[PDB]
């Protein structure tokens, strides 16, 4: 679909079999989801944005369905204020910016 | 034009008589630019990213040209690591997400 930006570009995602709302974020290198339980091994990591760094758990090769499009890639889980879908997964679903 | 998300969507902007590189950020409500001495009145504001909040200066009705497309709105100035074009200006240039 084509999504305008008058409102936050929020979509429903499915991850670990659970539905959630997330922000399609061209300004995020990585995908960062609020605290949740996910199956599989994980490594501690840290990521920075505006305001400083947060500590996250990095899950690799996680299945996630974004607005009906499947992706398999790295998902960071931590105390992010909003679920954000970053470029590592936006590229997989074929998302582009257009004007 | 169309912009893929393999790399950060960095483009040239023109503001206050200067050329800069900035990030087209669908995950940003607001536009935040690296420290610069714009003329005119401003008001203090605080904006939050994933790591917390920073102090910025809010300038209103500022013209920014983004890839030849003009937009006029509120521009925040403060200690951000990257020039960020947010939805308040991306809407004015007819920018959409497409997949
Ligand atoms: C309403 O609040 C807002 O709109 N705040 C805006 C904001 O911060 N939005 C966040 C999400 C958010 C956070 C908090 C509340 C609501 C939404 C997403 C945004 O695109 C940032 C931009 C950014 C790129 C590079 C370095 C620092 C920042 N990207 C990011 O933090 O990405 C992370 C993840 O991936 C990594 O790559 C880049 C840095 C890493 C802003 C106006 C301050 C800019």
PDB file of C-alpha atoms and ligand atoms in Angstrom:
ATOM      1  CA  UNK A   1       0.000   0.000   0.000  1.00  0.00           C
ATOM      2  CA  UNK A   2       0.831   3.720  -0.139  1.00  0.00           C
ATOM      3  CA  UNK A   3       1.050   5.367   3.290  1.00  0.00           C
ATOM      4  CA  UNK A   4       0.909   9.113   3.852  1.00  0.00           C
ATOM      5  CA  UNK A   5       2.532  10.686   6.896  1.00  0.00           C
ATOM      6  CA  UNK A   6      -0.144  12.993   8.343  1.00  0.00           C
ATOM      7  CA  UNK A   7      -0.307  10.481  11.199  1.00  0.00           C
ATOM      8  CA  UNK A   8       2.370   8.218  12.598  1.00  0.00           C
ATOM      9  CA  UNK A   9       2.864   5.288  10.142  1.00  0.00           C
ATOM     10  CA  UNK A  10       1.684   2.646  12.596  1.00  0.00           C
ATOM     11  CA  UNK A  11       0.905  -0.868  11.362  1.00  0.00           C
ATOM     12  CA  UNK A  12       0.055  -4.196  12.944  1.00  0.00           C
ATOM     13  CA  UNK A  13       2.907  -6.700  13.163  1.00  0.00           C
ATOM     14  CA  UNK A  14       2.939 -10.367  14.143  1.00  0.00           C
ATOM     15  CA  UNK A  15       5.960 -11.676  16.037  1.00  0.00           C
ATOM     16  CA  UNK A  16       6.319 -14.788  18.157  1.00  0.00           C
ATOM     17  CA  UNK A  17       2.689 -15.446  17.246  1.00  0.00           C
ATOM     18  CA  UNK A  18       1.581 -12.232  18.977  1.00  0.00           C
ATOM     19  CA  UNK A  19       0.085  -9.133  17.374  1.00  0.00           C
ATOM     20  CA  UNK A  20       1.492  -5.687  18.100  1.00  0.00           C
ATOM     21  CA  UNK A  21       1.498  -2.155  16.733  1.00  0.00           C
ATOM     22  CA  UNK A  22       4.756  -0.750  15.381  1.00  0.00           C
ATOM     23  CA  UNK A  23       6.071   2.364  13.677  1.00  0.00           C
ATOM     24  CA  UNK A  24       7.487   2.151  10.145  1.00  0.00           C
ATOM     25  CA  UNK A  25      10.678   4.136  10.749  1.00  0.00           C
ATOM     26  CA  UNK A  26      13.002   5.114   7.883  1.00  0.00           C
ATOM     27  CA  UNK A  27      15.203   6.901  10.438  1.00  0.00           C
ATOM     28  CA  UNK A  28      16.005   3.694  12.347  1.00  0.00           C
ATOM     29  CA  UNK A  29      18.910   1.495  11.283  1.00  0.00           C
ATOM     30  CA  UNK A  30      17.540  -1.309  13.457  1.00  0.00           C
ATOM     31  CA  UNK A  31      14.211  -2.703  14.632  1.00  0.00           C
ATOM     32  CA  UNK A  32      13.518  -2.191  18.347  1.00  0.00           C
ATOM     33  CA  UNK A  33      10.473  -3.610  20.134  1.00  0.00           C
ATOM     34  CA  UNK A  34       9.201  -2.962  23.636  1.00  0.00           C
ATOM     35  CA  UNK A  35       9.965  -5.485  26.357  1.00  0.00           C
ATOM     36  CA  UNK A  36       8.502  -8.891  25.505  1.00  0.00           C
ATOM     37  CA  UNK A  37       9.258 -12.603  25.725  1.00  0.00           C
ATOM     38  CA  UNK A  38      10.679 -14.142  22.556  1.00  0.00           C
ATOM     39  CA  UNK A  39      11.809 -17.730  21.926  1.00  0.00           C
ATOM     40  CA  UNK A  40      15.434 -18.352  21.041  1.00  0.00           C
ATOM     41  CA  UNK A  41      18.867 -17.314  22.217  1.00  0.00           C
ATOM     42  CA  UNK A  42      19.849 -13.663  22.517  1.00  0.00           C
ATOM     43  CA  UNK A  43      22.889 -11.500  23.174  1.00  0.00           C
ATOM     44  CA  UNK A  44      23.072  -8.267  25.196  1.00  0.00           C
ATOM     45  CA  UNK A  45      23.509  -5.150  23.109  1.00  0.00           C
ATOM     46  CA  UNK A  46      23.148  -1.400  23.356  1.00  0.00           C
ATOM     47  CA  UNK A  47      21.721   1.075  20.856  1.00  0.00           C
ATOM     48  CA  UNK A  48      21.736   4.862  20.853  1.00  0.00           C
ATOM     49  CA  UNK A  49      19.315   7.432  19.550  1.00  0.00           C
ATOM     50  CA  UNK A  50      18.296  10.902  20.664  1.00  0.00           C
ATOM     51  CA  UNK A  51      18.612  11.116  24.434  1.00  0.00           C
ATOM     52  CA  UNK A  52      21.276   8.419  24.825  1.00  0.00           C
ATOM     53  CA  UNK A  53      21.502   4.633  24.873  1.00  0.00           C
ATOM     54  CA  UNK A  54      19.263   1.807  26.022  1.00  0.00           C
ATOM     55  CA  UNK A  55      20.169  -1.790  26.789  1.00  0.00           C
ATOM     56  CA  UNK A  56      18.492  -4.324  24.515  1.00  0.00           C
ATOM     57  CA  UNK A  57      18.411  -8.053  23.861  1.00  0.00           C
ATOM     58  CA  UNK A  58      19.389  -8.863  20.283  1.00  0.00           C
ATOM     59  CA  UNK A  59      17.472 -11.711  18.644  1.00  0.00           C
ATOM     60  CA  UNK A  60      18.721 -12.791  15.222  1.00  0.00           C
ATOM     61  CA  UNK A  61      16.775 -14.378  12.358  1.00  0.00           C
ATOM     62  CA  UNK A  62      13.378 -13.762  13.961  1.00  0.00           C
ATOM     63  CA  UNK A  63      10.262 -14.191  11.846  1.00  0.00           C
ATOM     64  CA  UNK A  64       8.078 -11.080  11.807  1.00  0.00           C
ATOM     65  CA  UNK A  65       5.109 -10.206   9.590  1.00  0.00           C
ATOM     66  CA  UNK A  66       4.661  -6.500   8.859  1.00  0.00           C
ATOM     67  CA  UNK A  67       1.347  -5.380   7.375  1.00  0.00           C
ATOM     68  CA  UNK A  68       1.017  -8.738   5.626  1.00  0.00           C
ATOM     69  CA  UNK A  69       4.654  -8.977   4.478  1.00  0.00           C
ATOM     70  CA  UNK A  70       7.058 -11.472   6.002  1.00  0.00           C
ATOM     71  CA  UNK A  71      10.581 -10.672   7.134  1.00  0.00           C
ATOM     72  CA  UNK A  72      13.270 -12.670   8.929  1.00  0.00           C
ATOM     73  CA  UNK A  73      15.990 -10.641  10.581  1.00  0.00           C
ATOM     74  CA  UNK A  74      17.417  -9.042  13.681  1.00  0.00           C
ATOM     75  CA  UNK A  75      15.028  -7.766  16.356  1.00  0.00           C
ATOM     76  CA  UNK A  76      16.151  -5.767  19.384  1.00  0.00           C
ATOM     77  CA  UNK A  77      13.956  -6.037  22.493  1.00  0.00           C
ATOM     78  CA  UNK A  78      14.235  -3.431  25.226  1.00  0.00           C
ATOM     79  CA  UNK A  79      12.732  -0.384  26.969  1.00  0.00           C
ATOM     80  CA  UNK A  80      11.963   1.513  23.793  1.00  0.00           C
ATOM     81  CA  UNK A  81       9.105   4.040  24.073  1.00  0.00           C
ATOM     82  CA  UNK A  82       7.547   2.753  20.828  1.00  0.00           C
ATOM     83  CA  UNK A  83       7.826  -0.363  18.676  1.00  0.00           C
ATOM     84  CA  UNK A  84       9.873   0.717  15.659  1.00  0.00           C
ATOM     85  CA  UNK A  85      10.428  -1.199  12.423  1.00  0.00           C
ATOM     86  CA  UNK A  86      13.820  -0.111  11.100  1.00  0.00           C
ATOM     87  CA  UNK A  87      15.534  -0.314   7.736  1.00  0.00           C
ATOM     88  CA  UNK A  88      16.898  -3.826   8.306  1.00  0.00           C
ATOM     89  CA  UNK A  89      13.320  -5.124   7.944  1.00  0.00           C
ATOM     90  CA  UNK A  90      11.777  -2.352   5.825  1.00  0.00           C
ATOM     91  CA  UNK A  91      14.146  -3.327   3.007  1.00  0.00           C
ATOM     92  CA  UNK A  92      12.980  -6.947   3.244  1.00  0.00           C
ATOM     93  CA  UNK A  93       9.316  -6.041   2.655  1.00  0.00           C
ATOM     94  CA  UNK A  94      10.286  -3.798  -0.255  1.00  0.00           C
ATOM     95  CA  UNK A  95       9.485  -0.490   1.448  1.00  0.00           C
ATOM     96  CA  UNK A  96      10.617   2.740  -0.235  1.00  0.00           C
ATOM     97  CA  UNK A  97      10.143   6.474   0.228  1.00  0.00           C
ATOM     98  CA  UNK A  98       8.537   8.357  -2.657  1.00  0.00           C
ATOM     99  CA  UNK A  99       7.810  12.009  -3.393  1.00  0.00           C
TER     100      UNK A  99
ATOM    101  CA  UNK B   1      11.952  10.496  -6.901  1.00  0.00           C
ATOM    102  CA  UNK B   2      12.146   7.131  -5.108  1.00  0.00           C
ATOM    103  CA  UNK B   3      14.517   6.227  -2.272  1.00  0.00           C
ATOM    104  CA  UNK B   4      15.439   2.700  -1.208  1.00  0.00           C
ATOM    105  CA  UNK B   5      16.328   1.932   2.404  1.00  0.00           C
ATOM    106  CA  UNK B   6      19.497  -0.140   1.978  1.00  0.00           C
ATOM    107  CA  UNK B   7      21.325   2.929   3.318  1.00  0.00           C
ATOM    108  CA  UNK B   8      20.193   5.807   5.489  1.00  0.00           C
ATOM    109  CA  UNK B   9      17.849   8.008   3.366  1.00  0.00           C
ATOM    110  CA  UNK B  10      20.126  11.049   3.465  1.00  0.00           C
ATOM    111  CA  UNK B  11      19.357  13.965   1.139  1.00  0.00           C
ATOM    112  CA  UNK B  12      20.518  17.538   0.612  1.00  0.00           C
ATOM    113  CA  UNK B  13      18.395  20.248   2.226  1.00  0.00           C
ATOM    114  CA  UNK B  14      18.579  24.030   1.979  1.00  0.00           C
ATOM    115  CA  UNK B  15      17.776  26.051   5.109  1.00  0.00           C
ATOM    116  CA  UNK B  16      18.603  29.571   6.236  1.00  0.00           C
ATOM    117  CA  UNK B  17      20.862  29.964   3.222  1.00  0.00           C
ATOM    118  CA  UNK B  18      22.927  26.809   3.841  1.00  0.00           C
ATOM    119  CA  UNK B  19      23.136  23.353   2.281  1.00  0.00           C
ATOM    120  CA  UNK B  20      23.101  20.381   4.652  1.00  0.00           C
ATOM    121  CA  UNK B  21      22.589  16.622   4.593  1.00  0.00           C
ATOM    122  CA  UNK B  22      19.516  15.380   6.450  1.00  0.00           C
ATOM    123  CA  UNK B  23      17.661  12.156   7.194  1.00  0.00           C
ATOM    124  CA  UNK B  24      14.127  11.628   5.878  1.00  0.00           C
ATOM    125  CA  UNK B  25      12.604  10.144   9.022  1.00  0.00           C
ATOM    126  CA  UNK B  26       9.058   8.752   9.021  1.00  0.00           C
ATOM    127  CA  UNK B  27       9.599   7.880  12.695  1.00  0.00           C
ATOM    128  CA  UNK B  28      10.034  11.550  13.673  1.00  0.00           C
ATOM    129  CA  UNK B  29       7.031  13.685  14.599  1.00  0.00           C
ATOM    130  CA  UNK B  30       9.238  16.783  14.410  1.00  0.00           C
ATOM    131  CA  UNK B  31      12.190  18.129  12.445  1.00  0.00           C
ATOM    132  CA  UNK B  32      15.398  18.451  14.487  1.00  0.00           C
ATOM    133  CA  UNK B  33      18.582  19.948  13.040  1.00  0.00           C
ATOM    134  CA  UNK B  34      22.122  20.035  14.387  1.00  0.00           C
ATOM    135  CA  UNK B  35      23.149  23.193  16.245  1.00  0.00           C
ATOM    136  CA  UNK B  36      22.972  26.266  14.001  1.00  0.00           C
ATOM    137  CA  UNK B  37      22.437  29.981  14.637  1.00  0.00           C
ATOM    138  CA  UNK B  38      19.165  30.761  12.879  1.00  0.00           C
ATOM    139  CA  UNK B  39      17.828  34.337  13.154  1.00  0.00           C
ATOM    140  CA  UNK B  40      14.585  35.350  14.799  1.00  0.00           C
ATOM    141  CA  UNK B  41      12.566  34.459  17.849  1.00  0.00           C
ATOM    142  CA  UNK B  42      12.484  30.962  19.311  1.00  0.00           C
ATOM    143  CA  UNK B  43      11.017  29.105  22.273  1.00  0.00           C
ATOM    144  CA  UNK B  44      12.524  26.376  24.472  1.00  0.00           C
ATOM    145  CA  UNK B  45      11.282  22.845  23.924  1.00  0.00           C
ATOM    146  CA  UNK B  46      12.206  19.321  24.963  1.00  0.00           C
ATOM    147  CA  UNK B  47      11.868  16.338  22.625  1.00  0.00           C
ATOM    148  CA  UNK B  48      12.275  12.652  23.422  1.00  0.00           C
ATOM    149  CA  UNK B  49      14.064   9.907  21.554  1.00  0.00           C
ATOM    150  CA  UNK B  50      14.692   6.292  22.450  1.00  0.00           C
ATOM    151  CA  UNK B  51      17.297   7.230  25.066  1.00  0.00           C
ATOM    152  CA  UNK B  52      15.563  10.178  26.693  1.00  0.00           C
ATOM    153  CA  UNK B  53      14.976  13.886  26.182  1.00  0.00           C
ATOM    154  CA  UNK B  54      17.140  16.740  24.904  1.00  0.00           C
ATOM    155  CA  UNK B  55      16.767  20.513  25.011  1.00  0.00           C
ATOM    156  CA  UNK B  56      16.142  22.226  21.664  1.00  0.00           C
ATOM    157  CA  UNK B  57      15.193  25.655  20.333  1.00  0.00           C
ATOM    158  CA  UNK B  58      11.881  25.817  18.449  1.00  0.00           C
ATOM    159  CA  UNK B  59      11.720  28.084  15.381  1.00  0.00           C
ATOM    160  CA  UNK B  60       8.395  28.521  13.588  1.00  0.00           C
ATOM    161  CA  UNK B  61       7.552  29.070   9.912  1.00  0.00           C
ATOM    162  CA  UNK B  62      11.035  28.157   8.695  1.00  0.00           C
ATOM    163  CA  UNK B  63      11.531  27.324   5.017  1.00  0.00           C
ATOM    164  CA  UNK B  64      13.424  24.142   4.146  1.00  0.00           C
ATOM    165  CA  UNK B  65      13.945  22.906   0.595  1.00  0.00           C
ATOM    166  CA  UNK B  66      14.194  19.102   0.472  1.00  0.00           C
ATOM    167  CA  UNK B  67      15.453  17.686  -2.838  1.00  0.00           C
ATOM    168  CA  UNK B  68      14.012  20.716  -4.605  1.00  0.00           C
ATOM    169  CA  UNK B  69      10.681  20.462  -2.751  1.00  0.00           C
ATOM    170  CA  UNK B  70       9.916  23.363  -0.429  1.00  0.00           C
ATOM    171  CA  UNK B  71       8.314  23.028   3.002  1.00  0.00           C
ATOM    172  CA  UNK B  72       7.552  25.620   5.684  1.00  0.00           C
ATOM    173  CA  UNK B  73       7.037  24.681   9.298  1.00  0.00           C
ATOM    174  CA  UNK B  74       8.482  24.310  12.753  1.00  0.00           C
ATOM    175  CA  UNK B  75      12.188  23.459  12.965  1.00  0.00           C
ATOM    176  CA  UNK B  76      13.909  22.448  16.194  1.00  0.00           C
ATOM    177  CA  UNK B  77      17.617  23.069  16.774  1.00  0.00           C
ATOM    178  CA  UNK B  78      19.742  21.272  19.333  1.00  0.00           C
ATOM    179  CA  UNK B  79      22.394  18.636  20.090  1.00  0.00           C
ATOM    180  CA  UNK B  80      21.174  15.944  17.724  1.00  0.00           C
ATOM    181  CA  UNK B  81      23.740  13.636  16.068  1.00  0.00           C
ATOM    182  CA  UNK B  82      21.944  13.843  12.698  1.00  0.00           C
ATOM    183  CA  UNK B  83      19.820  16.374  10.849  1.00  0.00           C
ATOM    184  CA  UNK B  84      16.324  14.836  10.882  1.00  0.00           C
ATOM    185  CA  UNK B  85      13.427  15.747   8.586  1.00  0.00           C
ATOM    186  CA  UNK B  86      10.223  14.719  10.368  1.00  0.00           C
ATOM    187  CA  UNK B  87       6.629  14.174   9.310  1.00  0.00           C
ATOM    188  CA  UNK B  88       5.659  17.821   9.838  1.00  0.00           C
ATOM    189  CA  UNK B  89       7.730  18.621   6.730  1.00  0.00           C
ATOM    190  CA  UNK B  90       7.606  15.281   4.888  1.00  0.00           C
ATOM    191  CA  UNK B  91       3.833  15.676   4.469  1.00  0.00           C
ATOM    192  CA  UNK B  92       4.326  19.031   2.735  1.00  0.00           C
ATOM    193  CA  UNK B  93       6.536  17.496   0.018  1.00  0.00           C
ATOM    194  CA  UNK B  94       4.071  14.691  -0.733  1.00  0.00           C
ATOM    195  CA  UNK B  95       6.306  11.987   0.734  1.00  0.00           C
ATOM    196  CA  UNK B  96       4.849   8.510   1.207  1.00  0.00           C
ATOM    197  CA  UNK B  97       5.928   5.026   2.203  1.00  0.00           C
ATOM    198  CA  UNK B  98       5.287   2.379  -0.439  1.00  0.00           C
ATOM    199  CA  UNK B  99       5.484  -1.413  -0.408  1.00  0.00           C
TER     200      UNK B  99
HETATM  201  C1  LIG C   1       7.459  11.745  19.407  1.00  0.00           C
HETATM  202  O1  LIG C   1       8.840  11.584  19.551  1.00  0.00           O
HETATM  203  C2  LIG C   1       9.585  11.677  18.372  1.00  0.00           C
HETATM  204  O2  LIG C   1       9.054  11.718  17.305  1.00  0.00           O
HETATM  205  N1  LIG C   1      11.028  11.727  18.493  1.00  0.00           N
HETATM  206  C3  LIG C   1      11.881  11.560  17.331  1.00  0.00           C
HETATM  207  C4  LIG C   1      12.610  10.224  17.492  1.00  0.00           C
HETATM  208  O3  LIG C   1      13.624  10.123  18.104  1.00  0.00           O
HETATM  209  N2  LIG C   1      11.992   9.065  16.880  1.00  0.00           N
HETATM  210  C5  LIG C   1      12.572   7.740  16.989  1.00  0.00           C
HETATM  211  C6  LIG C   1      11.509   6.803  17.559  1.00  0.00           C
HETATM  212  C7  LIG C   1      10.828   7.410  18.779  1.00  0.00           C
HETATM  213  C8  LIG C   1      11.604   7.588  20.075  1.00  0.00           C
HETATM  214  C9  LIG C   1      10.923   8.197  21.294  1.00  0.00           C
HETATM  215  C10 LIG C   1       9.459   8.618  21.218  1.00  0.00           C
HETATM  216  C11 LIG C   1       8.681   8.437  19.920  1.00  0.00           C
HETATM  217  C12 LIG C   1       9.366   7.829  18.701  1.00  0.00           C
HETATM  218  C13 LIG C   1      12.942   7.172  15.628  1.00  0.00           C
HETATM  219  C14 LIG C   1      13.801   8.133  14.821  1.00  0.00           C
HETATM  220  O4  LIG C   1      13.757   7.711  13.491  1.00  0.00           O
HETATM  221  C15 LIG C   1      15.246   8.135  15.319  1.00  0.00           C
HETATM  222  C16 LIG C   1      16.008   9.204  14.546  1.00  0.00           C
HETATM  223  C17 LIG C   1      17.493   9.067  14.856  1.00  0.00           C
HETATM  224  C18 LIG C   1      18.447   8.489  13.818  1.00  0.00           C
HETATM  225  C19 LIG C   1      19.931   8.356  14.140  1.00  0.00           C
HETATM  226  C20 LIG C   1      20.460   8.797  15.495  1.00  0.00           C
HETATM  227  C21 LIG C   1      19.507   9.376  16.531  1.00  0.00           C
HETATM  228  C22 LIG C   1      18.026   9.511  16.214  1.00  0.00           C
HETATM  229  N3  LIG C   1      15.880   6.861  15.046  1.00  0.00           N
HETATM  230  C23 LIG C   1      16.308   5.962  16.096  1.00  0.00           C
HETATM  231  O5  LIG C   1      16.344   6.295  17.236  1.00  0.00           O
HETATM  232  O6  LIG C   1      16.677   4.682  15.675  1.00  0.00           O
HETATM  233  C24 LIG C   1      17.374   3.768  16.625  1.00  0.00           C
HETATM  234  C25 LIG C   1      17.005   2.629  16.400  1.00  0.00           C
HETATM  235  O7  LIG C   1      17.833   2.207  15.220  1.00  0.00           O
HETATM  236  C26 LIG C   1      19.149   2.987  15.385  1.00  0.00           C
HETATM  237  O8  LIG C   1      19.471   3.844  14.039  1.00  0.00           O
HETATM  238  C27 LIG C   1      19.298   5.091  14.315  1.00  0.00           C
HETATM  239  C28 LIG C   1      19.456   5.180  15.758  1.00  0.00           C
HETATM  240  C29 LIG C   1      18.983   3.761  16.294  1.00  0.00           C
HETATM  241  C30 LIG C   1      12.811  12.765  17.216  1.00  0.00           C
HETATM  242  C31 LIG C   1      11.949  13.969  16.835  1.00  0.00           C
HETATM  243  C32 LIG C   1      13.551  13.066  18.522  1.00  0.00           C
HETATM  244  C33 LIG C   1      13.820  12.506  16.101  1.00  0.00           C
END
